[PDB]
Design goal:
Helix content: 40-55%
Main location: nucleus
Structural class: alpha+beta
Subunit structure: Monomer. Binds single-stranded DNA (ssDNA). Interacts with APEX1, LIG1, LIG3, FEN1, PCNA and XRCC1. Interacts with HUWE1/ARF-BP1, STUB1/CHIP and USP47. Interacts with FAM168A.
Radius of gyration: 23 Å
Number of helices: 16
Number of strands: 9
Distance between the termini: 15 Å
Strand content: 5-15%
Bound molecules: the ligand Cc1cn([C@H]2C[C@H](O)[C@@H](COP(=O)(O)NP(=O)(O)OP(=O)(O)O)O2)c(=O)[nH]c1=O, magnesium ion, sodium ion
Subcellular location: Nucleus; Cytoplasm
CATH superfamily of one domain: Beta Polymerase, domain 2
Cofactor: Mg(2+)
Protein name: DNA polymerase beta
CATH topology of one domain: Beta Polymerase, domain 2
Length: 326
DNA sequence: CCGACATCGCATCAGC
DNA sequence: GCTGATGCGA
DNA sequence: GTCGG
């Protein structure tokens, strides 16, 4: 349904969600508000009262009261107030820097560091991740057109095969769902020699090669199985491209398709597919699918050699990635 | 009344 | 030195 | 904040 229908309400709830996570440090209120915003966004009617909204799962007494005030006044007294509040609004904003969470944002503001300009004057007080997040603040909030994603995929697949032709690399996330644009790039990686019981260099080799051809420009974090970094397409006369976020995960061969499924998403799709994993005694994480015991204890991971099989367990017929927005 | 609310890899801190 | 706890992003 | 044991 159109955003115009209840966009005022869902915007209100989303904003309330952010202040709970970032300022109050209340992650479960954050999720509570997001759940309510999500169920209202789908509601195919213009809400006329808080009582009407309360019928929806996730909308309770308090949010009903808030909707009634919003409907009556076009605003929320509490939200207007915290908006004007220099301390809280500065804390909330600083968390938009990748690496600065609710705790670090609080500490910065506590000592008078409230803006991007303040952060730029105080590099000594930032860790490696936070410096990169600051350096590319604007770029990291930009979206990536599918055309650039395809160009980015071309490079990753080419360099990965160049290192070792037995590698298998899959770009997942919103890209795999065929989305017209993405927020970042999620790469899943595997190799015939790495399974449930087996170098740390398997991931390193790839990262290093992508650095060699000057695709990967910065590193946020890098372990034996998980890389988080920054990349950039080569210049065109044309201006240069924005720097983008890219993750690369090395996953055991015998867990690849659970991984591919999990990190393809969507969030809301996985949340739904997991809920019905329960439906008839299955549990699914990013590694395995397991049967639940007679009293709810998961047993042995089952064999999986395709996304298909994971569907052949909870008894749901295959959904193409393009249909997994929900 | 009151506990659950998703989970995991990596960087960094708290402390022995 | 080290192990364990916490912050963080996805 | 919501839900339910
Ligand atoms: C944010 C998030 C994502 N995921 C999973 C589902 C996502 O589909 C997948 C990748 O995360 P993402 O890159 O933030 N989401 P996306 O790739 O579908 O969409 P976008 O274009 O990156 O915004 O990882 C979680 O399991 N827990 C999370 O908190
Ligand atoms: Mg993504
Ligand atoms: Mg991502
Ligand atoms: Na309700
Ligand atoms: Na942040």
């Amino acid at each position: 349904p159109q955003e115009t229908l209840n966009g005022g309400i869902t915007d209100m709830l989303t904003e309330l969600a952010n202040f709970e996570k970032n300022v109050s440090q209340a992650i479960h209120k954050y999720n509570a508000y997001r759940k309510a915003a999500s169920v209202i966004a789908k509601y195919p009617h213009k809400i006329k009262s808080g009582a009407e909204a309360k019928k929806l799962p996730g909308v309770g007494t308090k949010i009903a009261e808030k909707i009634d005030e919003f409907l009556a006044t076009g605003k929320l007294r509490k939200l207007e107030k915290i908006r004007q509040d220099d301390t809280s609004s500065s804390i909330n904003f600083l968390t938009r820097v990748s690496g600065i969470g609710p705790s670090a944002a609080r500490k910065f503001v506590d000592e008078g560091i409230k803006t991007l300009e303040d952060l730029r004057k105080n590099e000594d007080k930032l860790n490696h991740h936070q410096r990169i997040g600051l350096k590319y603040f604007g770029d990291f909030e930009k979206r990536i057109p599918r055309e650039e994603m395809l160009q980015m995929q071309d490079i990753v697949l080419n360099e990965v095969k160049k290192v070792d032709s037995e590698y298998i690399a899959t770009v997942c996330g919103s890209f795999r769902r065929g989305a017209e644009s993405s927020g970042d790039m999620d790469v899943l990686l595997t190799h015939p020699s790495f399974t449930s019981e087996s170098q740390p260099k398997l991931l390193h080799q790839v990262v290093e090669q992508l650095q060699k051809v000057h695709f990967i420009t910065d590193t946020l974090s890098k372990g034996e199985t998980k890389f988080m970094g920054v990349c950039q397409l080569p210049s065109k006369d044309e201006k240069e491209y924005p720097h983008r976020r890219i993750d690369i995960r090395l996953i055991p061969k015998d867990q690849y398709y659970c991984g591919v499924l999990y990190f393809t998403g969507s969030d809301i799709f996985n949340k739904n597919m997991r809920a019905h994993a329960l439906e008839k005694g299955f549990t699914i994480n990013e590694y395995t699918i397991r049967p639940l015991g007679v009293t709810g204890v998961a047993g042995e991971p089952l064999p999986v050699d395709s996304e298909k099989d994971i569907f052949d367990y909870i008894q749901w017929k295959y959904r193409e990635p393009k249909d997994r927005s929900e």
